[PDB]
Amino acid sequence: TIEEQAKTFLDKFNHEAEDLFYQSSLASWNYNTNITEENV
């Protein structure tokens, strides 16, 4: 094993978490830099 299959779950958690947090953070950077209601 249950620990060896728990390393498998967090290995594929960490791949899609990094690419998808980057889009959530870059879109928030563009709003705080450039106030438009298009960017809300």
Ligand SMILES: *[C@@H]1O[C@H](CO)[C@@H](O[C@@H]2O[C@H](CO)[C@@H](O)[C@H](O)[C@H]2NC(C)=O)[C@H](O)[C@H]1NC(C)=O
């Ligand atoms: C701030 O955000 C607006 C979007 O609301 C940007 O306006 C775009 O500007 C590009 C040119 O750089 C145009 O091709 C787009 O059509 C524009 N979009 C809209 C909805 O007008 C604006 O450029 C941003 N400011 C900066 C400095 O990047």
